[PDB]
PDB file of C-alpha atoms in Angstrom:
ATOM      1  CA  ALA P   2      25.573 -34.213  -1.288  1.00  0.00           C
ATOM      2  CA  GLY P   3      28.433 -34.934   0.320  1.00  0.00           C
ATOM      3  CA  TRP P   4      31.509 -34.669  -1.482  1.00  0.00           C
ATOM      4  CA  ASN P   5      30.132 -31.786  -3.887  1.00  0.00           C
ATOM      5  CA  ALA P   6      30.116 -30.278  -0.679  1.00  0.00           C
ATOM      6  CA  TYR P   7      33.688 -29.937  -0.846  1.00  0.00           C
ATOM      7  CA  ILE P   8      33.962 -28.845  -5.100  1.00  0.00           C
ATOM      8  CA  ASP P   9      31.690 -25.820  -3.879  1.00  0.00           C
ATOM      9  CA  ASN P  10      34.477 -24.527  -1.859  1.00  0.00           C
ATOM     10  CA  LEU P  11      36.928 -24.840  -4.118  1.00  0.00           C
ATOM     11  CA  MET P  12      34.557 -22.917  -6.590  1.00  0.00           C
ATOM     12  CA  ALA P  13      33.365 -20.904  -4.216  1.00  0.00           C
ATOM     13  CA  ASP P  14      35.814 -17.485  -5.437  1.00  0.00           C
ATOM     14  CA  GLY P  15      35.898 -17.159  -9.470  1.00  0.00           C
ATOM     15  CA  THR P  16      39.733 -18.098  -9.496  1.00  0.00           C
ATOM     16  CA  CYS P  17      39.651 -21.959 -10.157  1.00  0.00           C
ATOM     17  CA  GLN P  18      38.051 -23.299 -13.149  1.00  0.00           C
ATOM     18  CA  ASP P  19      38.010 -26.839 -12.400  1.00  0.00           C
ATOM     19  CA  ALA P  20      38.080 -29.162  -9.800  1.00  0.00           C
ATOM     20  CA  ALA P  21      37.902 -32.974  -8.364  1.00  0.00           C
ATOM     21  CA  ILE P  22      38.058 -35.725  -5.446  1.00  0.00           C
ATOM     22  CA  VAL P  23      38.743 -39.088  -7.723  1.00  0.00           C
ATOM     23  CA  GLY P  24      38.807 -41.931  -5.729  1.00  0.00           C
ATOM     24  CA  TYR P  25      42.245 -44.343  -6.854  1.00  0.00           C
ATOM     25  CA  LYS P  26      41.857 -47.199  -4.368  1.00  0.00           C
ATOM     26  CA  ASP P  27      40.959 -50.478  -6.630  1.00  0.00           C
ATOM     27  CA  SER P  28      38.784 -49.172  -8.892  1.00  0.00           C
ATOM     28  CA  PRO P  29      39.483 -45.438  -9.842  1.00  0.00           C
ATOM     29  CA  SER P  30      36.519 -43.206 -10.392  1.00  0.00           C
ATOM     30  CA  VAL P  31      35.354 -39.070 -10.099  1.00  0.00           C
ATOM     31  CA  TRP P  32      33.558 -39.141  -6.626  1.00  0.00           C
ATOM     32  CA  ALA P  33      32.972 -36.005  -7.142  1.00  0.00           C
ATOM     33  CA  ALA P  34      33.549 -31.612 -10.113  1.00  0.00           C
ATOM     34  CA  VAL P  35      33.035 -29.387 -11.329  1.00  0.00           C
ATOM     35  CA  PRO P  36      30.421 -30.709 -14.590  1.00  0.00           C
ATOM     36  CA  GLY P  37      30.890 -29.816 -17.747  1.00  0.00           C
ATOM     37  CA  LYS P  38      34.179 -29.465 -17.226  1.00  0.00           C
ATOM     38  CA  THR P  39      37.811 -31.261 -18.157  1.00  0.00           C
ATOM     39  CA  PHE P  40      37.956 -33.451 -14.756  1.00  0.00           C
ATOM     40  CA  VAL P  41      34.902 -34.740 -14.664  1.00  0.00           C
ATOM     41  CA  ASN P  42      36.380 -36.831 -18.167  1.00  0.00           C
ATOM     42  CA  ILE P  43      39.611 -38.414 -15.897  1.00  0.00           C
ATOM     43  CA  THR P  44      40.606 -41.451 -16.403  1.00  0.00           C
ATOM     44  CA  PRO P  45      41.877 -44.993 -14.966  1.00  0.00           C
ATOM     45  CA  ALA P  46      44.958 -44.642 -16.991  1.00  0.00           C
ATOM     46  CA  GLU P  47      45.461 -41.577 -16.511  1.00  0.00           C
ATOM     47  CA  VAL P  48      45.350 -41.686 -12.718  1.00  0.00           C
ATOM     48  CA  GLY P  49      47.442 -45.098 -12.891  1.00  0.00           C
ATOM     49  CA  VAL P  50      50.017 -42.342 -14.354  1.00  0.00           C
ATOM     50  CA  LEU P  51      49.334 -39.841 -12.025  1.00  0.00           C
ATOM     51  CA  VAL P  52      50.242 -42.564  -8.472  1.00  0.00           C
ATOM     52  CA  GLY P  53      52.290 -44.810 -11.049  1.00  0.00           C
ATOM     53  CA  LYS P  54      55.487 -46.147 -10.017  1.00  0.00           C
ATOM     54  CA  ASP P  55      57.639 -44.693 -12.751  1.00  0.00           C
ATOM     55  CA  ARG P  56      57.656 -40.763 -11.919  1.00  0.00           C
ATOM     56  CA  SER P  57      60.277 -39.271 -15.230  1.00  0.00           C
ATOM     57  CA  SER P  58      58.482 -40.237 -17.839  1.00  0.00           C
ATOM     58  CA  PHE P  59      55.651 -38.183 -17.493  1.00  0.00           C
ATOM     59  CA  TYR P  60      58.361 -34.807 -17.422  1.00  0.00           C
ATOM     60  CA  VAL P  61      59.431 -35.133 -20.298  1.00  0.00           C
ATOM     61  CA  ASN P  62      56.735 -36.201 -22.138  1.00  0.00           C
ATOM     62  CA  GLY P  63      54.110 -34.920 -20.056  1.00  0.00           C
ATOM     63  CA  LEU P  64      50.191 -36.375 -18.910  1.00  0.00           C
ATOM     64  CA  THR P  65      46.530 -36.349 -19.147  1.00  0.00           C
ATOM     65  CA  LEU P  66      44.127 -35.001 -17.174  1.00  0.00           C
ATOM     66  CA  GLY P  67      40.272 -35.575 -18.804  1.00  0.00           C
ATOM     67  CA  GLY P  68      43.335 -34.992 -22.336  1.00  0.00           C
ATOM     68  CA  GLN P  69      43.692 -32.452 -20.989  1.00  0.00           C
ATOM     69  CA  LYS P  70      47.757 -32.618 -22.453  1.00  0.00           C
ATOM     70  CA  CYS P  71      49.555 -31.188 -19.157  1.00  0.00           C
ATOM     71  CA  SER P  72      53.380 -30.810 -18.162  1.00  0.00           C
ATOM     72  CA  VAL P  73      54.730 -30.940 -14.854  1.00  0.00           C
ATOM     73  CA  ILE P  74      56.560 -28.235 -13.557  1.00  0.00           C
ATOM     74  CA  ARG P  75      57.218 -30.431  -9.895  1.00  0.00           C
ATOM     75  CA  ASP P  76      56.038 -34.068  -9.126  1.00  0.00           C
ATOM     76  CA  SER P  77      56.078 -34.612  -4.527  1.00  0.00           C
ATOM     77  CA  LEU P  78      52.683 -36.612  -4.971  1.00  0.00           C
ATOM     78  CA  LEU P  79      54.167 -39.871  -3.091  1.00  0.00           C
ATOM     79  CA  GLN P  80      55.787 -37.685  -0.556  1.00  0.00           C
ATOM     80  CA  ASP P  81      54.962 -38.304   2.241  1.00  0.00           C
ATOM     81  CA  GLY P  82      53.748 -34.654   3.996  1.00  0.00           C
ATOM     82  CA  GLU P  83      53.626 -32.978   0.855  1.00  0.00           C
ATOM     83  CA  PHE P  84      51.567 -35.396  -1.389  1.00  0.00           C
ATOM     84  CA  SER P  85      51.128 -32.676  -4.220  1.00  0.00           C
ATOM     85  CA  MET P  86      51.995 -32.279  -7.798  1.00  0.00           C
ATOM     86  CA  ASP P  87      52.222 -28.988  -9.721  1.00  0.00           C
ATOM     87  CA  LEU P  88      51.057 -28.557 -13.435  1.00  0.00           C
ATOM     88  CA  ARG P  89      50.292 -26.279 -16.039  1.00  0.00           C
ATOM     89  CA  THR P  90      48.809 -26.989 -19.436  1.00  0.00           C
ATOM     90  CA  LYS P  91      49.953 -26.891 -22.674  1.00  0.00           C
ATOM     91  CA  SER P  92      47.990 -24.346 -24.879  1.00  0.00           C
ATOM     92  CA  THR P  98      47.962 -22.391 -20.411  1.00  0.00           C
ATOM     93  CA  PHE P  99      46.273 -22.764 -16.520  1.00  0.00           C
ATOM     94  CA  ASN P 100      47.725 -24.141 -13.762  1.00  0.00           C
ATOM     95  CA  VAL P 101      47.307 -27.077 -12.195  1.00  0.00           C
ATOM     96  CA  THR P 102      47.598 -28.609  -8.573  1.00  0.00           C
ATOM     97  CA  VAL P 103      47.226 -32.605  -7.718  1.00  0.00           C
ATOM     98  CA  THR P 104      46.792 -33.316  -4.268  1.00  0.00           C
ATOM     99  CA  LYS P 105      47.004 -37.156  -3.010  1.00  0.00           C
ATOM    100  CA  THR P 106      45.166 -38.463   0.154  1.00  0.00           C
ATOM    101  CA  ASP P 107      44.772 -41.925   1.387  1.00  0.00           C
ATOM    102  CA  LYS P 108      41.752 -42.828  -0.918  1.00  0.00           C
ATOM    103  CA  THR P 109      41.168 -39.574  -3.147  1.00  0.00           C
ATOM    104  CA  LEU P 110      43.086 -37.327  -5.264  1.00  0.00           C
ATOM    105  CA  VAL P 111      41.830 -33.693  -5.230  1.00  0.00           C
ATOM    106  CA  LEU P 112      42.093 -31.829  -8.478  1.00  0.00           C
ATOM    107  CA  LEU P 113      41.973 -28.170  -8.943  1.00  0.00           C
ATOM    108  CA  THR P 114      42.922 -26.034 -12.115  1.00  0.00           C
ATOM    109  CA  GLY P 115      43.249 -22.246 -11.450  1.00  0.00           C
ATOM    110  CA  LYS P 116      41.516 -20.128 -14.514  1.00  0.00           C
ATOM    111  CA  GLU P 117      44.364 -17.711 -16.632  1.00  0.00           C
ATOM    112  CA  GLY P 118      46.339 -15.874 -15.698  1.00  0.00           C
ATOM    113  CA  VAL P 119      45.278 -17.317 -11.586  1.00  0.00           C
ATOM    114  CA  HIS P 120      49.378 -18.219  -9.902  1.00  0.00           C
ATOM    115  CA  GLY P 121      50.210 -22.021  -9.750  1.00  0.00           C
ATOM    116  CA  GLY P 122      51.283 -20.968  -5.309  1.00  0.00           C
ATOM    117  CA  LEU P 123      48.320 -20.090  -4.590  1.00  0.00           C
ATOM    118  CA  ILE P 124      46.414 -23.004  -6.464  1.00  0.00           C
ATOM    119  CA  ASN P 125      48.875 -25.323  -4.823  1.00  0.00           C
ATOM    120  CA  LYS P 126      47.932 -24.122  -1.726  1.00  0.00           C
ATOM    121  CA  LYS P 127      44.745 -25.124  -2.189  1.00  0.00           C
ATOM    122  CA  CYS P 128      43.996 -28.089  -3.761  1.00  0.00           C
ATOM    123  CA  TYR P 129      46.828 -28.824  -0.383  1.00  0.00           C
ATOM    124  CA  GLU P 130      44.637 -27.621   1.941  1.00  0.00           C
ATOM    125  CA  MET P 131      41.627 -29.482   0.944  1.00  0.00           C
ATOM    126  CA  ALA P 132      43.890 -32.462   0.398  1.00  0.00           C
ATOM    127  CA  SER P 133      45.425 -32.125   4.619  1.00  0.00           C
ATOM    128  CA  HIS P 134      41.579 -31.538   5.340  1.00  0.00           C
ATOM    129  CA  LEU P 135      40.482 -34.977   3.906  1.00  0.00           C
ATOM    130  CA  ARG P 136      43.272 -36.954   5.286  1.00  0.00           C
ATOM    131  CA  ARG P 137      42.386 -35.538   8.677  1.00  0.00           C
ATOM    132  CA  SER P 138      39.183 -36.979   8.184  1.00  0.00           C
ATOM    133  CA  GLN P 139      40.517 -40.758   7.314  1.00  0.00           C
ATOM    134  CA  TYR P 140      39.800 -40.286   3.985  1.00  0.00           C
TER     135      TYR P 140
END
């Protein structure tokens, strides 16, 4: 399938334990993801927080992704050219969320996997989608 091929890309190595593509326009929903994981259960309320205008409250408190509580280490999701938010779960795995024109690309590496490489991998996927006018 179309979008599912992109997940197989992100999960090709054993590092990343979960990944997803989620449309956030109009009515949010998962476009592609890893079955039996967490991102498959992301809610549009959680999506509204990610792309929200209040970007100081998920710092103190943190947000959730598919119910999975996470802290925030870095937020540049609304920054053009950068469009990424780095996260770390509250057990801990490192997470990166990137924003395209129509989607959110989410990815979390397994235990011990550096959040920097996760950011590079996730930023690479969103950069590709952006050029595909997505």
